[PDB]
Design goal:
This protein has 367 residues and is α+β, with helices and mostly antiparallel strands. It has ten helices and 15 strands. It binds (11alpha,14beta)-11,17,21-trihydroxypregn-4-ene-3,20-dione. Glycans are attached at residues 59, 139, 223, 293, 332.
Length: 367
């Protein structure tokens, strides 16, 4: 199923990304990356197609591709539904150079399954081109995601874009008057001052006995839900390595209503990731080679993928969360329990309804 494959991609992408930069704050939106690369797969063939879909985790021996795109159409559709549009939006776009014309079926497919806009662009003028697209993404994410492509790209004739924006409200908001500056212990040799939020509430709590960590689950107004995982000091990678469907399943069953003095910091983090190295570690490599099969994009031209970029922002306050994420792919011609989050921790934001991993975080430093 889609929900299982997507989250396994989420955790796998997360684990691999964690290993590449062990001191940086890590914040990503897995569903954005999965929908974008799946939309890209519509224009791929041969070994490139098979390798991509397999990297996203779908078994193309027990599952058709139409089913997959039918699967992402269903999610894209559900993240439009009236009761979630106010708090969540997701969308796709295709930017195309005038020298190229899409095959009827490709442009028809991206419009049917992904509701993608296809917009003409003059890529010969890349300064203008990255300006048009960055603002487009800027606007679609209400200004949270700024300058997605940056000046350090060689020009490219096709750009596939996906964006996600999410604004949730705590069912149990933190106490506004209670926020104070506390110590957040970043390393054994690095200490920072951070705004620490506080609430004393009945909260879902679990001290894990099989893993060196403690965790809480909080819901948002709507269908949003979030996990906060605090590993024991120096056990961050043991908890990350254990992140799977089986662990969160075991956690959900273990979470019990408890009295908690909950201290979480006001996190404002962002991250920019070239997912080239990350994706090829996951086995998605043919896209970038001069043997790339993009024959379903257009009739005549050989296309390869030049760049895959993800950008995401996180804001945490007493009232809620404000998150945004974007992926782009460039193609070229071939008694109360005291729980204190004053050290590195994990954030996992999910949707109760679809189980889509919306946002994953490794907070090394919350400032
Ligand atoms: C592994 C699980 C169930 C089987 C599956 O194919 C995929 C997933 C990924 C998301 C998990 C889900 C269930 O376990 C319940 C979870 C943890 C959910 C994310 C949010 C959670 O729904 C809950 O909030 C339940 O309280």
């Amino acid at each position: 199923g889609l929900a299982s494959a997507n989250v396994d991609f989420a955790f796998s992408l997360y684990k691999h990304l964690v290993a590449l930069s062990p001191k940086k704050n890590i914040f990503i939106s897995p569903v954005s990356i999965s929908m974008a690369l799946a939309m890209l797969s519509l224009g791929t063939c041969g070994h490139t197609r098979a390798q991509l879909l397999q990297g996203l985790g779908f078994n193309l021996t027990e599952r058709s591709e139409t089913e997959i795109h039918q699967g992402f159409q269903h999610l894209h559709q559900l993240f439009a539904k009236s009761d979630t549009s106010l708090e969540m939006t997701m969308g796709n776009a295709l930017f195309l150079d005038g020298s190229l014309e899409l095959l009827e079926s490709f442009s028809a497919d991206i419009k049917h399954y992904y509701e993608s806009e296809v917009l003409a662009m003059n890529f010969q003028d890349w300064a203008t081109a990255s300006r048009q697209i960055n603002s487009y993404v800027k606007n679609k994410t209400q200004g949270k995601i700024v300058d997605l492509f940056s000046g350090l790209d060689s020009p490219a004739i096709l750009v596939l874009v996906n964006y996600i924006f999410f604004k949730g409200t705590w069912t149990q908001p933190f106490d506004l008057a209670s926020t104070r500056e506390e110590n957040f212990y970043v390393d054994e040799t690095t200490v920072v001052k951070v705004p620490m939020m506080l609430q004393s509430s009945t909260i879902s709590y679990l001290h894990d006995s099989e893993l060196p960590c403690q965790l809480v689950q909080m819901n948002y107004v709507g269908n949003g839900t979030v996990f906060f995982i605090l590993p024991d000091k120096g056990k961050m990678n043991t908890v990350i390595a254990a992140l799977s469907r089986d662990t969160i399943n075991r956690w959900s069953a273990g979470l019990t209503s408890s009295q908690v003095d909950l201290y979480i910091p006001k996190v404002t983090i962002s991250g920019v990731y070239d997912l080239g190295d990350v994706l090829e570690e996951m086995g998605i490599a043919d896209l970038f080679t001069n043997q790339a099969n993009f024959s379903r994009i257009t009739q005549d031209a050989q296309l390869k993928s030049s760049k895959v970029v993800h950008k995401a922002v996180l804001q945490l306050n007493e009232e809620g969360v404000d998150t945004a994420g974007s992926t782009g792919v460039t193609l070229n011609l071939r008694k109360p329990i005291i729980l204190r989050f004053n050290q590195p921790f994990i954030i996992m934001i999910f949707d109760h309804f679809t189980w889509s991993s919306l946002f994953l975080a490794r907070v090394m430093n919350p400032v």
